[model samples]
Target: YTLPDPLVGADGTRVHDRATWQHRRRPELLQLFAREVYGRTPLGRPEGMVFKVTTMEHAALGGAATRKEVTVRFGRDPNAPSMQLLLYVPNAVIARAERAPVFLGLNFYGNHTVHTDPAIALSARWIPAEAPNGANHRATEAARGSDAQKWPVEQILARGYAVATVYCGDLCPDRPDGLNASVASWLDAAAGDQRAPDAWGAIGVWAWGLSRALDYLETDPLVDASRVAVHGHSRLGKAALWAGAQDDRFALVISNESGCGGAALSKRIHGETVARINTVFPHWFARNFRRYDDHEEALPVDQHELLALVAPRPLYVASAEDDDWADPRGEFLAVKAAEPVFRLFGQTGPSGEDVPRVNEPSGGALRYHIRPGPAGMTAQDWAFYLAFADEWLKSALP
Candidate 1:
């Protein structure tokens, strides 16, 4: 199936410059995507929000890393939904810049699972009925550092950048029924009309939550909000792409194994087809997305355009070579399609059509690499992702 040209404008015109893109084509495509795919996020920031620093460890992670914990509270009251943020800044880089660059992402399990630190609070957020622990997303002591393999906290700190993360379930649970389990429920309670037919589903809300996390970062003198990058794996990676697409504040976007309605082109129909994902995880996308199940050709937009929404911003897409379910080749092709938009901004991308062999990352403003595994984040993927980030961000930030 032939994909729609994202470089073409809404009125059948060509997008040639950043000005027209920002004023015309960009808004039209963005609105179409929001209304027909990811759903419409609630507008504006919440009022009376506050950030409380719960933990500040000057000498932590064996003196190589300094950790901090912040609680994000919406509304004027603590009674509102709150989520905890975990942060680690390198002591070696604190003196390099007044505020350090940070990579912000959403975690699947809990904050405590990312590291072995006993001080990080357990998530206590709701998950699907059959969470791995059988307690519906409750974090157990046994789960500590379980996800350490995905997050390279020590390696990131060693590279002279800060890292921050929050549990995805804390913002909204993965289950369809869990919309009322957290912030969505809080918003529904206040407005009484939050979950409209076109309202944001779990993925949309998670992206919105990422922006809120950035709001917190803006308040912190230790974090360079302007230089923050959003990274995620699988479903969270989808959220990261969506967040970076809609929220321009995210300086860089990194998507790992985010296929289907994510980094892979929908028209390819390669792996995790729209029908399957929407059927099994209805909460992940909008109610409208279901209409396109098995009807991808009729879709007004595809995943490539989603990457285009990031525009001139640095974008990295990763995959696992044996992770056939993610369609690594499809991801590469999608980024190739998005190169035209990068060209509009005078930036680089996967210049040619040939997808690089495993571990060979190509392109410029757009970059991608496939790990030799089965749908998992490995050290090799993070190593390449951070290095690519540093190439653009080390001197890009103030």
Candidate 2:
């Protein structure tokens, strides 16, 4: 059966659509949204990951072999008035000619928080929660990647993958006044003030930042850029989804409880519905998003269509049953609904039509799973992602 005709928004604006959604109507809306909501910016041509240093810095205490730490700058250079990236790579290669796959993302605290590796560049970002008036939290040295539990560095490397991380705050500080902290300074210097409601939001800036990280990965002779999967949890999950959507370079996308604007259907009256999210996180989306909260039926676009934008590509949407805040069911159903778009491109999606067991994983081309865990990321969560990436990257042996 074909989809119904285009719907209308509260303001009576036309919401065009047809049977094949993503390839057709979705593009049109994206064009409009980019122009009016996110404001199309110049291609994020990064300056590339400038070499920091590859040291024999031991990230772990006395676990295994020595770790290789490499940090490079992306976008503009900090010393020369630009944004830079600090990266770290394990020395698994020279010891075995093995190019470890990199798990790249903008770090929340600092690269140091990931491991106790002094090699990782410590973020100078001001964390008022800890440091107060920009008084150096010094996430370097002692913090050397201490959060390896969440990072699971040993597990990842054992699977023959290297990890590369950077401080996200370097790209843009996560705050309501995103414009005040992000690369906005650089843009404003050249393009002048851009506070219009239609300008790009924090999410947009964060997504663009991912592509830059990808750029660094490409140049790293030790990395297989094509297999790089963009993974994000919670709000970052939303950023990962949007980044993968806009930039097709991302081979795999893993969104863990992205909620509201990620996989969850904004129109659905589930746990953190559109209305509740917008009220709580105002800076996450365009100003126009606020108008569609409780009035989701008025939205020109539904999240199912958003999931469709990823097309035949491997898109994995995982949720937590206990985390109602992320609207788990809505996210699963969104994938179920997006199956048609995948079929248009000759891909099977959402393992099933019905919502399987609470811990059951669903979907084909577009997969969905609500594992038995809280809203936070768990081993099962990473298992699904590694499994998905394995399918996409590891082809049938020769």
Candidate 3:
């Protein structure tokens, strides 16, 4: 008989022998993945990194009157150059501005895409294909109302809150193969080899960018920096969770879908397995991440730890029942795993042992829901985020 596939392993991925699963199989995979795949430890001792911010004014984005734009730049990449965050504050005269709490989200396109306001800065940077395009320097008109639905502007400002966003593409382009254009060029060998055992990858770059955004927010007078939340979708969701985990400055976090490396368990996950994600987006993770794509058991630190990194902070992980590509079940499991840490902080954490109905929202320290729709943020998702923020941030102090 031919030799059996090693990945099938001796237990057939079965849990009949819980002891073997925990002590033997589990440890084996964790060591391999933590050391080889995700890498042994995150670089630059957490405490050693400092947050910095500088503000600049932009007068040329649009010539019209009635708006003003400010850029808050922050954080040194250490291995990479520091990144800047663009902020557009509406004229206090135009809107009853109240020096508000802010909406934090990652933009794949430049800041200009958020609105056509001439006062906003136009980033001379690459825009991720996922973002709307105008084929010209501007976004298509359809995009104007498209994202507007997602941004509850008047509602937010009316509530004494403002919105802050950064184009993620400004930090790093989401491409699979371009070292010359990659931040790796800015990395020091001490940070790890770009093509080696543990190195800076797309997630690291995104996480760094979030910190920069945080740095900028802390300095903005109009923003209650302490109440700022970090939010993202899909891969950006993973980035948000990582940023929150590594940076406690974020008062709230919302992860939409963000399966696989985000909110899903490697073993119980049912959608977009490690293999599929790496094969499709080869540049998203450290080169070593590919090593465990097919060898899931060899990977350490599943999405649960990724969530644990944010323990006690208000975190909302959402999934759509139809988004099989993101493994909704596994997403719940990760939230469940992170519950203990949240409990220490005194919060509900994950709500139940099982996934709730699509429309049913649950959890506290680790809030989550599996709504009845497919992937992508819907009005329902926004509604939950808004509500969650009210509960999570109302008590936060700057």
Candidate lDDT scores, in order, read: 0.84, 0.64, 0.63
Q: After superposition, how far is residue 280 of candidate 2 from its true place, in Å?
A: 2.9
Q: What is the per-residue lDDT of model 3 for residues 46-163, given as tens digits with 9 covering 90 to 100? A: 3333444344343222411122344433224455344445454444412444455666777656666666554355565555556665455345544443345455544554444456
Better of 1 and 2 by lDDT: 1
Q: After superposing candidate 1 on the true structure, give the runs of residues whose Cα lies further than 4 Å from its correct spot.
A: 95-97, 127-136, 188-194, 394-398
Q: Candidate 1 residues 1-398, lDDT tens each?
A: 79899978767889778998878887888888888889888774798888999989977789887789999987777688888899998888776656788999998888888888887887777644443453545677777787888889999988878989998888888876767775766775546744666767888888988998999999988778899989999989999999999999888999999988889988887878889888988877778998899998999998899999998899999888887777788888889888889888888887557667888888887888876769878999889988888787636425
Please provide, for model 2 over 1-398, each residue's C-alpha lDDT reduced to its tens digit, 9 standing for 90 to 100.
12222233334455344443544566665655454334454456644436444464544435443454545454335543233454444555435765556565555665667666555555666432432223354443555555555576666665655666655666666656555766655554535554555566667777787887787667766667776677777877888887877777776777888887888877777778766766776666666666666777766566676677676678889888788887887888788777766766677776555666765666655788888868767777777766676666533135
TM-scores of all candidate predictions against the true structure: 0.95, 0.81, 0.76
- Give candidate 2's error at residue 120 in angstroms: 2.8
TM-score of 1: 0.95
Question: Quick one: best lDDT, which candidate?
Answer: 1
Top candidate (TM-score): 1
Best first by lDDT, ranked: 1, 2, 3
Q: Can you rank all candidates by TM-score, best first?
A: 1, 2, 3
Error in Å for residue 199 of model 3: 0.9
